[PDB]
């Protein structure tokens, strides 16, 4: 057991030291590396549960039971005397820097969960290289360093989604005594999108000066892993060229899917192409109906767009039904319109004018479930029916990395691929939720447990998540369908509430809209199961429940705490309607 | 065990009914319980871990030992035959409403406490009254039903803060490319008041909508305890009468301080009079420095004030004080203006102009703590320094109900004062977080144990907090200094963190939003705090409560996962130690 994980350890290390803190032989030898810019792991025994343990297994590799103990690349330097030698004689830096490979660590794809892993692991003494290319889309749209969170997801479209929800502040404002009149105010476009836009490219360039200053190579190119230590490079002169590494973590996203129809390359665009569109869309078609649907349709409604959205079947597959509903009820309540059981089978009428700064105009033939007939034009088209990775023009079936039916990477839980030196995380890997602090987790818990002996793994289990629709749905958990199907209709009992933001009330807005619900477990003292909450700032409400749900809080636990008022959150805390009962939820 | 507490349960249970789910015998008496409108506790002693037990001792109150068993006020009344025999004879009234009192409960107060105890008992068939009144404030003053938090507390003071925050949500728009300019518009004080009072009224309607639905008798009337069941009122003509109660819930509330200084009384205001005011404050002082004091401070400064804060030693005494100086120097840099280490020794200069709805003037002189002097002219000079109760109006002392040093209610932890059948809750229980959920939470507890058999007490302990400053201050646990004082500072460790909310890039600070988790090193890194100073701060707080309930540790928050984007998230990745001296900064 020490012995399995010490050798691990070792093997993999890049520049370790096993130590103890009240050791001055120890301090002597850490001063001497820091002086040398020799960066490293550090391990001190004195601070470990089985740390005498340890001392002992280490003679195994070194013949020696003491403290300090170096190493390099899986091979013993020294003690104290021994690299002190090296470093007068000038023949340490040498010795740090021989490596079977040019780095020990290079990571395919330089978006959230791959800048994470990267930084971390050079912060070890691990040598590191980031490899980032983007693909333009069909009409060309590129971005900067940072991957698709920060370029073309949950960066810009939540500043668009604060720019729609600043259109209720200002009618607000007037019933709170404020002299505007909301009714002669406009939006700019394009106003927006340079504020957006610049800052989108002051986090391109913060996260360049974030490798140089942790002495990561960056190397903007597209990288093709043709065997288990080497990858192929190609720059931006379509040179070509390998380099090699140790470990290698595949980090590489999806991009959106088109549906295979006449005019829908040529003509639409998807959110890679919406955050910095020149023009405003216009009246715009969304198709699709997963949350990246929803939240842009969400915003271009509120800043003044006549927007409609196609549904094939139903609303957010995936979630929670009955909070989905509520969700698009809101929507389409508040001017957006919904196309229903309804699919696209696209004709160009104007091209885009891109001279005066204005959308072409399209039309758009389709057909509802029971054979009715589509027929309308549009300013902008723009797909959202789902996003795809294409590992084929990542990595080689020749090197032996097993995918699954989608095309995702299949893993263990520490995420080793079938080939033993390479890793996946992020939307790659099979099976995970595809979100960004959750690559962002992977990866740096993968990085500490290749360079610093950690041995913390990843857990995926109950990640909470928010929809940035005009009304936000925050959950943590299972759906109510999905405990219900579990456990039986019976074990389930369901508290719910409609509530009143107080902030709504001398803005007259609606009673009884927002909503939450705890899906509980009977047969286990009414353990939470779900939360589900629907309301303004839906993803600050739920943040802190989930560390309570990943405690094991139930129903009595929410009971017995205290509210915090006036706040939307504390309705959590007085929960007593239940579904069985058949009493109303409205106040 | 099982014998004392049915024992307990019986003797002040109004009207209790010991049942099983399975027995179509108790159905048959459950069904003519109500239509003859009799409500009524249940309990089913099949849902009872030690049912069996209770079912033998019930035998030695009614000499049976079967279900159903109804009891009244004490008394056994009988099983499925009797009650139907009393039902048929139209007997059945008779015997429910005998009582040796007037009202199984008098609720003395009709606030957020009061209110919730009295609606909670009478579920459970106890007859009961709720008292309220509102003593005018000295220049007159008053309000309608609800207590404090509703008619001049938490509710019109958060409503009075959005309207601050939307002053800036307004500059924000122009940024987020929407057109209006920020610097032509103005601020309407009488159009906010006009609005706020409304949803405040359709809160007193409500509340006495609630009590009428639920059989409460609601007298608007001075309540004085005058003896163990004997509670003394005076209506709105100086009518004075006497009813009697079984148990007695005390619920009276606190009433603002004014400092003993002349003109005081005389010339300023306090928040009781804030929140309904005709006129803009204009020119303000607000003397004091607590909650209150910057809250009001903050809102008047946002919607277009001049304001200064005259504080005597320290901010928010009794709260973290790196947070309370962060929630200050905020305050500073936006607007409010501080007379530090200073206090009042209030001359009037203009009558207040009723007619033309406009402030007075005032010349207000103090002194700092050196000697120096201070010397300056306002329009509304607003104390804030601190509250208290008077129970000595609620309360005689030959009553026998024991008070603290401060004049509050000294209470055993079912909320139990010194006289067997009065019991006390909300502000005037002494030692008690002073908040309405707290109180909400004691009331409901205290009547189903009074009525329905509940065992369940009221935790008072990590009870959350925020402070709605123009940014707010959310908190769950000990301040930093209160945990190394306790614990030593070797085994104290602090995470800590700058953070910019996204909501702030496009808008234009990116270092003052903070947060930091006091962790206790020998209990496994336990969380003994929680703080945050930022935007939603009550909504990013409040879930953590239920973690921090649970004993949440450092590692805890570490193996949860982000939202993203969210200000909360910034809690789930912590890891710069103030111990470390690595900057918090982003
Ligand atoms: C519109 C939208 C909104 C979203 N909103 C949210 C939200 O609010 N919250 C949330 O948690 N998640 C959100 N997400 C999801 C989040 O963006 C992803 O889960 C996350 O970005 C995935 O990170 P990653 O490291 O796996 O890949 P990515 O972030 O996609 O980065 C991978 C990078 O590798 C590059 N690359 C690909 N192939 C190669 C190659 N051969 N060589 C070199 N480089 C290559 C890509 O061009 C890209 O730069 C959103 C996604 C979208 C599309
Ligand atoms: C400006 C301000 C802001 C606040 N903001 C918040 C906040 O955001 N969150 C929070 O949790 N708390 C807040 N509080 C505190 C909150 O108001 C109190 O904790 C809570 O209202 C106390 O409830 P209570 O039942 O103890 O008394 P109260 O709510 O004060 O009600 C007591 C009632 O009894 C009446 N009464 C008194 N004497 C008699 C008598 N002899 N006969 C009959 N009736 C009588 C009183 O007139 C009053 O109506 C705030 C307080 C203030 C002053
Ligand atoms: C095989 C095919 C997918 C391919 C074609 C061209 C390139 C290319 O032009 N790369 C690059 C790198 C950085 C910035 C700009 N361009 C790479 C791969
Ligand atoms: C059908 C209805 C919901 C609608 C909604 C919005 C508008 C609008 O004010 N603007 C608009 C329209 C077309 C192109 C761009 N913007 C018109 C109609
Ligand atoms: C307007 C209505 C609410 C009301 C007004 C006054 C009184 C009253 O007579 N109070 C009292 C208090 C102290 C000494 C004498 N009387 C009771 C209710
Ligand atoms: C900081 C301080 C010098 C100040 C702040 C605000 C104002 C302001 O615009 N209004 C105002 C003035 C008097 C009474 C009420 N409001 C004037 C001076």
Redesign the interface.
Known sequence: GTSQWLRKTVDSAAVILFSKTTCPYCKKVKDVLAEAKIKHATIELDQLSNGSAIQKCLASFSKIETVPQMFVRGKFIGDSQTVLKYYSNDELAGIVNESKYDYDLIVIGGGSGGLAAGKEAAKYGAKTAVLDYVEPTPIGTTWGLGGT?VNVG??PK??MH??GL??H??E??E??????DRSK????????VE??QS?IGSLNWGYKVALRDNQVTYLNAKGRLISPHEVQITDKNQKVSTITGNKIILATGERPKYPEIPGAVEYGITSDDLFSLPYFPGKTLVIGASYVALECAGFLASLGGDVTVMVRSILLRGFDQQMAEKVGDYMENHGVKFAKLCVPDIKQLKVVDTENNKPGLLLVKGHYTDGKKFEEEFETVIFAVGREPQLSKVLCETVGVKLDKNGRVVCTDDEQTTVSNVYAIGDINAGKPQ????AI?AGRYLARRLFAGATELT?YSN????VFTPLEY?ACGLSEEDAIEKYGDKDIEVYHSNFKP??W??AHREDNVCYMKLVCRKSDNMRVLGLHVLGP?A??????????I??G?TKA??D???????????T???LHVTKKSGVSPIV
């Open positions: 969170c949950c960066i939540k500043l604060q720019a600043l259109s502040a200002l607000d404002a019933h709170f005594g404020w002299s505007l105010i406009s939006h700019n476009w394009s106003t927006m504020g957006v800052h979100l960004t602090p959750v987790q857990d990640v909470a998540t928010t925050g107080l902030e009330t001398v700032n993803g600050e409400i739920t943040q802190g429940y989930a560390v309570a990943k405690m809080a636990d929410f017995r705490t205290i509210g915090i008022h006036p706040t939307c959150s504390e959590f805390t007085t």
